[PDB]
Amino acid sequence: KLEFMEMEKEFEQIDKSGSWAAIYQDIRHEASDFPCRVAKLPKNKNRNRYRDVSPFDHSRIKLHQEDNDYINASLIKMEEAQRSYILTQGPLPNTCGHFWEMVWEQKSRGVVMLNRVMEKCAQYWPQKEEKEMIFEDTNLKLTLISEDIKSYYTVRQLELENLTTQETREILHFHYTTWPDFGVPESPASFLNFLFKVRESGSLSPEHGPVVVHCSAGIGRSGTFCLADTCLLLMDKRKDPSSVDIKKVLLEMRKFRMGLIQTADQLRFSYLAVIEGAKFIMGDS
Ligand SMILES: COC(=O)c1ccc([C@@](C/C=C/c2ccccc2)(Cc2ccc(C(F)(F)P(=O)(O)O)cc2)n2nnc3ccccc32)cc1
Numbered sequence: 312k313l314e315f316m317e318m319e320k321e322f323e324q325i326d327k328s329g330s331w332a333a334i335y336q337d338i339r340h341e342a343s344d345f346p347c348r349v350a351k352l353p354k355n356k357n358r359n360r361y362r363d364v365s366p367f368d369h370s371r372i373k374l375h376q377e378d379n380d381y382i383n384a385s386l387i388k389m390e391e392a393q394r395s396y397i398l399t400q401g402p403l404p405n406t407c408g409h410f411w412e413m414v415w416e417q418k419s420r421g422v423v424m425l426n427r428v429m430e431k432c433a434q435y436w437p438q439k440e441e442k443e444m445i446f447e448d449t450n451l452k453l454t455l456i457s458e459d460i461k462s463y464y465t466v467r468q469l470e471l472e473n474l475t476t477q478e479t480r481e482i483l484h485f486h487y488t489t490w491p492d493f494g495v496p497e498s499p500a501s502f503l504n505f506l507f508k509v510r511e512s513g514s515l516s517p518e519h520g521p522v523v524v525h526c527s528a529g530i531g532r533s534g535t536f537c538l539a540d541t542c543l544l545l546m547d548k549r550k551d552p553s554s555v556d557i558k559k560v561l562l563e564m565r566k567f568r569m570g571l572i573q574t575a576d577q578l579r580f581s582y583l584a585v586i587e588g589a590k591f592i593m594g595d596s
């Protein structure tokens with residue numbers, strides 16, 4: 312029985328009544344709030360891209376660093392969906408070493424980037440194979456191994472080396488290049504293809520640390536990506552796909568980092584991509 316017909320019928324109802332803005336505002340104003348005391352310390356001012364975008368103390372990633380353990384990065388743990396993500400801001404010129412430090416320490420194998428370096432964000436990875444990067448502060452080396460450019464995203468293989476131990480790891484970089492700030496992806500299809508590619512790569516697997524997802528602030532596009540991924544896992548893990556309340560899921564995620572999903576349009580897009588994504592996986596796969 313087409314249960315997807317019932318939930319696409321009410322998506323059409325929200326579209327027809329023009330109710331996306333009200334629904335999104337109702338989410339914003341129900342969102343939880345927690346202290347961000349460490350983000351707001353004097354010494355950490357230059358470690359934050361944006362004045363108001365801060366990680367909650369309870370969910371922030373700690374660098375393994377005695378001097379200063381702070382990075383603007385939050386751990387999103389989705390218990391029922393059985394998925395963890397790290398959401399972070401676009402690295403600053405002074406935080407690139409901290410970023411790769413975080414990647415190493417958290418044993419992530421995948422980085423998901425949803426913004427562009429020039430739209431901001433530092434060039435935190437090598438653009439050229441023959442020109443490696445050394446992060447002197449954190450004692451790490453990064454080399455671009457491969458780069459596969461498509462029209463709406465780019466997939467890169469990176470080698471991250473700990474210069475202290477000399478161990479190296481392969482890091483997969485999934486860069487969605489056509490998603491404007493406060494905007495939407497080019498299409499549901501392009502979004503879903505990008506997401507399925509991340510999934511198939513093994514980067515989201517519990518064998519590894521959490522995937523690192525970032526945009527510029529690490530809240531709007533980052534929140535949209537993770538919401539869509541989480542809701543798809545829930546629609547598959549559950550007996551009833553229509554039981555998945557995207558509002559309830561977003562609020563849950565927002566317990567771990569503020570401001571996730573930044574526009575009513577991004578919310579609507581997340582619903583659309585989840586409905587389309589669930590048709591695909593729960594239909595002929
Ligand atoms: C022309 O507009 C801007 O230059 C601009 C700059 C910063 C911002 C955000 C606006 C602050 C939003 C916010 C902060 C705390 C909780 C919830 C929302 C930061 C922000 C930038 C981009 C995004 C995004 F959605 F494009 P992402 O996809 O990269 O995450 C989000 C946020 N911000 N953070 N502190 C601020 C202080 C004064 C004014 C704006 C401030 C918004 C617009």
Ligand SMILES: [Cl-]
Pocket residue numbers: 339569570571572573
């Ligand atoms: Cl918000």
